[PDB]
Structure formats: structure tokens, C-alpha cells
Amino acid sequence: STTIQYNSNYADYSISSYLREWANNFGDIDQAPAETKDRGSFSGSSTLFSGTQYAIGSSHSNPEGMIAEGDLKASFMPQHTFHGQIDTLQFGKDLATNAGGPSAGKHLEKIDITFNELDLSGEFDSGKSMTENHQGDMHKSVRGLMKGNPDPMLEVMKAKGINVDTAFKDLSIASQYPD
Ligand code: HEM
Predict the structure, then answer these.
(1) Which candidate among 41, 117, 138, 164 keeps its CA 20 to 30 Å from the CA of 70?
(2) Which residue has the CA at smallest separation from atom 21 of ligand 1?
(3) What is the CATH number of domain 1-179?
(4) What are the record keywords, sorted (predicted)?
């Protein structure tokens, strides 16, 4: 039931084509300095590590950013597993905080791509090991993007039957943002 909305500027792009460009400019978060490192923030919480929205900016002083929305949970130390369900995934640039500090959540100033009703799930089990907790679709695909790697997300999407090779122009589940 997933659909996609794209800026008219990325009509010649595909899901893979775009995400590879976004990730390479977002960069691997671990290779970044602690100086400029952004580990993302949760909002709609009462919580430091859960909320309805998760937004994170590039850790290499680049404009790229990402916003996930749904039922999101972070397990923190020692496993640090991102689990729950992502309904809406959005990519763009210039992450900006909403009026009311981080607590009001953040927004992207330039929206490129938006996945809707993606149904990106993942469970966490405290009794189980880290390795197996990291196999969840949600964690391994989002963590991959955080490490500037679009590949895990791309095979999760392909497993969902979503075409990641066709340009947004001719992709049936994708429509263009009115400019
Ligand atoms: C407000 C949000 C978050 C904060 C403040 C936070 C904090 C931290 C801290 C302090 C570390 C240890 C330092 C380091 O390894 O660089 C860490 C590591 C890590 N983080 Fe996060 N985290 C957050 C959310 C997330 C999310 C959403 C993911 C994945 C999608 C994630 C995945 C990881 C992983 C895989 C490690 C490896 C360290 C280990 O497993 O021992 N974290 N995080």
C-alpha cells in the first residue's frame, strides 16, 4: 500500500539512484567527528529514546537530512536497537527545528522524497542477543542510512515488491509534488 511523493527535480532519479546520492553526501556517522555528530532526536515523547518522530541531519556538515514518523523506539545501551514501525519516511535537506525547541519535532526545509504507508517494522527482545536484534528491517535499514549506506534499505524495499530501479517519472506508486 506504499506510495511515494517526489520533487519534480528528481524525476529522472530512481529510489536507488537518489538514496545513493543522499547517503554519500550524508556520510557515515561513525567516521564523522564528535564535533559535528548528530545522533538524531526523538519527539512526541516524554522520552529521550522514543517518539512519533525521529529526525537526523548529516554529521559531515552537509545539508542532507532524514525524518522518520510512526511508532519509534531506541533501546540504548548496550545493544542500541532501533525498533517499532515507520509509517512515513522522508528525505531532503536543511533540517530545521519546529517552534518550541526540539520538543515540537523538526522539519525539512527542502523535501525531495517521501515514502508513505511504508510499513517498516522491527521488534526488540531484551532476552535475545544484539546480532539478532539488529536483523530487524527497521534497525538494519535506518542504521545503514545513518552510516551512509543505502543498500540495506534498498533490499528491504525490494522485498516489499517496490521497484527501486525505475525512475520516479514512470514509477507507478510515485506521484510528483505540485510546485
Ligand atoms: C537521540 C537518539 C540517540 C542517541 C542520543 C544515541 C546515543 C548513542 C551513543 C552515546 C552511542 C555510543 C557512542 C558511539 O558508539 O558512537 C551510540 C551508539 C550506537 N548507536 Fe545510538 N543513539 C540514538 C539513536 C540511535 C538510532 C536511531 C540508531 C539506529 C537507527 C542507533 C544506533 C546505534 C548503534 C548501532 C551504536 C553502536 C554502539 C554499540 O552498539 O555499542 N542509535 N548511540
Answers:
(1) 164
(2) 80
(3) 3.30.1500.10
(4) Heme, Iron, Metal-binding
